[PDB]
Amino acid sequence: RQINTEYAVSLLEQLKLFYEQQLFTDIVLIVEGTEFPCHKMVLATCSSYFRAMFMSGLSESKQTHVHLRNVDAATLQIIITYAYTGNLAMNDSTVEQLYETACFLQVEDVLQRCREYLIKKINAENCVRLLSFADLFSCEELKQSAKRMVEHKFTAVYHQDAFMQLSHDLLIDILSSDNLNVEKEETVREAAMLWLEYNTESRSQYLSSVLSQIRIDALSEVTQRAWFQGLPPNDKSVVVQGLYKDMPKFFKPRLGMTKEEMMIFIEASSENPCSLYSSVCYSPQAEKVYKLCSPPADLHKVGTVVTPDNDIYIAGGQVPLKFRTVNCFYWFDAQQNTWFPKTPMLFVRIKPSLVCCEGYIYAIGGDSVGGELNRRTVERYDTEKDEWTMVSPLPCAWQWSAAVVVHDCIYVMTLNLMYCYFPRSDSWVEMAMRQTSRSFASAAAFGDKIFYIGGLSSVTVEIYDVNKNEWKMAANIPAKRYSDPCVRAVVISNSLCVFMRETHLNERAKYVTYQYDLELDRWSLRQHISERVLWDLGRDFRCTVGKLYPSCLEESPWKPPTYL
Amino acid sequence: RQINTEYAVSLLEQLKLFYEQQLFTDIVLIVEGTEFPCHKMVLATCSSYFRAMFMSGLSESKQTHVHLRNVDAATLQIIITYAYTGNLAMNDSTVEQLYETACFLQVEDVLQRCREYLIKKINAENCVRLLSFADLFSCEELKQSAKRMVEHKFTAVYHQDAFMQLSHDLLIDILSSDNLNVEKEETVREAAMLWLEYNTESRSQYLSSVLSQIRIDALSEVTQRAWFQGLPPNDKSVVVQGLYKDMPKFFKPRLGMTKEEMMIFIEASSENPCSLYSSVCYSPQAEKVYKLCSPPADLHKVGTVVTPDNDIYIAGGQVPLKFRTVNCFYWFDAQQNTWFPKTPMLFVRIKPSLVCCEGYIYAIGGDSVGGELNRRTVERYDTEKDEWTMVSPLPCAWQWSAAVVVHDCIYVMTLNLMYCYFPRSDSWVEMAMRQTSRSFASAAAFGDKIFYIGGLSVTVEIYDVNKNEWKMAANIPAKRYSDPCVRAVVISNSLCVFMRETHLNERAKYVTYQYDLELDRWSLRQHISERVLWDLGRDFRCTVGKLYPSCLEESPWKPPTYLFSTD
Q1: Do B3 and A12 touch (CB under 8 A)?
Q2: Partners of residue A54 in chain B, C-beta under 8 Å
Q3: Which residues carry this modification: Phosphoserine (chain B)?
Q4: In angstroms, rounded to a whole number, what is the distance separating the alpha carbons of residues A387 and B12?
Q5: Crossing angle of helices A140-152/A108-119, nearest 10°?
Q6: How far is B110 from chain A (nearest CA, A)?
């Protein structure tokens, strides 16, 4: 027999009614002059510290006045409020002080909630501060989560003041870890140089430990440029996933050095009978296909986005109704190969046009909810504040639209029109209209030209100029006649390309990528996507450009060759 | 924001864990030598007594040992268990002492739970004791319920020892009530006499108050026996619903002198658009139809059963899908026209064959065929223990079977076979088979003769309990080219059949016939016109019982004549 529930919820609120009117007050806690009368029974059930001080049978259990030092009055009131109600009202301003008060009082409930709250709030401005906070209080869960964040953005957080004030042990494990996301070893060297000169009188004795952690005789990728680039086409990538593997871990190339630009395909068909919307990526350099996990747990019709800072996110989508639309939002971990969750959106969405502009992520379109109220729903997200905010909606409600960013400007395109959003003005300005009405097309950005390619699709290519505000035809995608190419515009190696999947009559899917000539207005054959890999991915697949860790992701083509 | 629930239950289970190991025990209650360590806060939050004792700021809030007298140790332990858990384990053996202990500590929750438990547990044995208990402890709801129960079965409970030990106020408030279910005032007179002679030395001064409450010059239904019975056919019931109403309440005929034998029709198709599955009753002596609020949960497919003590019950059936089958058991209050639910059945049933045998009501079949041993199950209810007991199940799975009781024996009939059950042996015995295989037939018990009438084609088949032989009697006079529908019921100590016949291009006709057992002939008894009656459908269940028309219900719902023969 389980204990009563409606009686427990009534006994708890009856205790609060007595606490507010100060009945049965047997102990008075004195903290920096402020008095807080409470019950010895309630504090023991919530905090094990009071349970130990009251059950000891000493004068602390007999004296009504107990002086608690090094405890904030504001945090103590929150602990007592949680002891009589059970709801913890945490905020990013007083979470670090509440955790210090909770661990000093050893509250299993508050410590667990404050721990998971800090983990899901690790950004790029508090990573270093929370790392020293975790080491000071010995939180192995927060320390590991904060350390991985430092390793992911080490080249961007080593300028903060919190980095030069780190302890000696907090430095020896960061520099020795091979997860530093750095393109060159000089960045790690200079990061160690600025740390020792911050406080020379106290760190002059640690000069030997600093140089012993920075790899100087490593010579990761400066050796390949020395001899030559002579290899099969762009096989410098095979060395990245080979030499880096077998090494004494003292001269290993750091994880940042181990990076490869891969065409990220999300919601693709699965070779094995499974979640029909799988996620795999292809490396144009190593010509290899690596598999990606889907913690989204069968998300469908989702959007993609890649920031200039090489960050990957997904938003919106639909999950199978135990299909229902949700407002989920997940960030991909380039090292752990997962999909952590982040502050959800305000409105549920399906395939929103996610774009990054001036560090902000914008969710455009995405399954219009409430046609009577508004259909052109759009909202922005703050990377650090971790909050969502509504903005000026689209001037009209459209479907299957695309969104791009050029020169800190948000461009949304539709059937034949285009509107430009200015975050500095929070308004929409109609731009030059398109000559052809096309839908379901692909959009890309390169330099000062916006490309709206594909659409009904066709091989028609439109080149728009931001400086001239003109739409003009340049060329047609060279494809075989009577074919059905589902094209996707992608920019790689500082050059616009088209990932064209061609399916012909009675023929299987053929993948191939071409390179466009900007000066000659021509399309050159860049690379044929080997059919010994990259199985059929369907047509509704989403694609984007990003860099991932060949060193560590999930190398599994699983495509049996020697066929027919 | 609402108060958290999981944190509340976690705190409660942690407090229970601390109480089991005796942590932070600040008060020690001493009851008849037994010690109980406990917390003052829990006793204050639960009981208003301890709250007032602790918030007074006297030595009671400072002294750790508090001596509580006139409190049972087991009841105090149960109260503490409820305070630390929230569940109350009540039983019919220690409910009164628990209620007494609760009324001393004013545990609102425990008081209300014990009150409603005592209310739902008034049977035909504890009524007087519970009435005295409620009078001593001033519980108005329990007092009123026990008073109504005593008024319902006064002639059956005035022999109990608890009735002679009642106080003066209880006697003068029971005897003065016009709800005494007694057929003659001599019963109440003898009850008052035995009450006053039970303890003469203490009640010799109350003889005047005793004699002032018994109606002597009433002469309710003897005056009609003096002059004559000369009236329209059996119009004595008219005198009942007229003289009894307008009366100074001192010479009022008691409620027991008002009950009339009426044909109880349940699930009778109704013209009412909202309740088309209502129930109405017809009085053959009054030639009048009365409305019933029978459906307690707007359900149907429930059986009927009338004990020889004139008690109505319905069980089984299914409520519309909010058609989920249920187990609720409802007893009809003939005075308030409202059904009080009872202990639900163990297995759900649809139109169960409910019959009264040796004071027990047996549920026989009445369910869709599911499982060999899972179906054919028979279960009986205990009127006083308020529990269901399983018995020997049916030998074979049957459909549209009837059940009767003769000489305290159970009989169920089927297509062509027949099985007799004996509660003393708890076994099934196949009896004399019938020459015809029929279904949907109606059966009624009249003496040592079982009458199996129906078939869906009518033939009157007589079975002899003493001879175990089936003999043919007759065929119910009716019409083939039309629509027949018979309901065999025994009323006025005579077998009858209420036959509903729908003729070609004509509405349903109603008429009651009387059968002669000796001459083996069916005689026309009384034609039931549609003056206050209407189409009652075909799936309606029928039975015979005595009810008070005085305060049952008054609604014609049918204009007598409607002939626009003006032309």
Answers
A1: yes
A2: 24
A3: 294
A4: 37
A5: 10
A6: 12
A300: nearest Cα among A324, A272, A329, A335: A324
CA atoms within 13 A on the CB side of B191: 27
Measured between CB atoms, does A53 come within 8 Å of chain B?
no
Tokens 């008849």, located at residue: B32
Q: What was the structure determination method?
A: cryo-EM
* Contact at CB, A11 and B109, closer than 8 angstroms: no
B359 Ramachandran zone, left/alpha/beta (phi>0; psi -120 to 50): left
- Judge: A44–B55 Cβ closer than 8 Å, yes or no: no
In A97-156, the residues whose Cβ lies within 8 Å of chain B are 109
User: From CA A517, how far away is CA A524, in angstroms rounded?
Assistant: 7
The B418-422 sheet, strands edge to edge = B402-406, B409-413, B418-422, B427-430
* A223 contact partners, CB below 8 Å, separation of at least 6: none
Token reading at A121: 């709030």
Residue B429 β-bridge partners = B420
CA distance B104 to chain A (A): 21
Inter-chain touch A3–B9, beta carbons under 8 Å: yes
Specify the long-range contacts of residues A450-455, CB closer than 8 Å, at least 24 apart.
A450/A404, A450/A406, A450/A411, A451/A489, A451/A496, A452/A402, A452/A413, A453/A477, A453/A487, A453/A489, A453/A498, A454/A487, A454/A488, A454/A489
DSSP A62-114: H-SEEE--S--HHHHHHHHHHHHT------SSSHHHHHHHHHHHT-HHHHHHH
- CA-derived radius of gyration, chain B: 29
Cross-chain Cβ contact B5/A8 below 8 Å = yes
> Helix, strand, coil % (nearest 5) of chain B?
25, 30, 45
C-beta atoms of B24 and A44 within 8 A? yes
Asked if the C-beta of B88 comes within 8 angstroms of chain A's C-beta atoms, the answer is: no
Half-sphere exposure of B501 (CA within 13 A, CB side): 19
Full DSSP string of A323-342: -EE---EEEE-TTT--EEE-
* Chain A residues with beta carbon closer than 8 angstroms to that of B44: 18, 24
| Strand pairing category for A427-430 and A418-422 | antiparallel
CA distance A327 to chain B (A): 24
Q: Are A157 and A128 in contact (CB under 8 A)?
A: yes
The contacts of residue B272 (CB under 8 Å, 6+ apart) are: B278, B557
Indicate the residue of A7, A24, A87 with minimum beta-carbon distance to B41: A24
Contact A72, A96 (CB under 8 A): no
Q: Are B549 and B288 in contact (CB under 8 A)?
A: yes
Number of residues written out for chain A: 564
Give the separation between CA B561 and CA A266, rounded to whole angstroms: 81
On whether the CB atoms of residues B72 and B97 are closer than 8 A, the answer is yes
Instruction: Count other C-beta atoms under 10 Å from residue A483's C-beta.
Output: 14
Q: Which residue has tokens 């996707």?
A: A488
A287 and A299 Cβ atoms separated by less than 8 Å: no
Tracing tokens 């140790």 back to the chain, one arrives at: B73
Per DSSP, the residues of A499-543 read EEEEE-TT--EEEEEEEEETTTTEEEEEEE--TTSS----SS-EE
Q: Can you tell me which residue has the tokens 């010690």?
A: B35
Q: Chain A contact for B1, CB < 8 A? A: yes
CB contact under 8 A, A41 and B45: no
Judge whether B178 and B252 are in contact, CB under 8 Å: yes
Measured in Å, how far apart are chain B's first and last C-alpha atoms? 74
Distance CA A336, CA A341 (A): 14
- Integer Cα distance of A45 and A15 in angstroms: 13
CB atoms within 10 A of CB A448: 12
Instruction: List the single residue in B9, B14, B39 with the smallest CB-CB distance to A5.
Output: B9
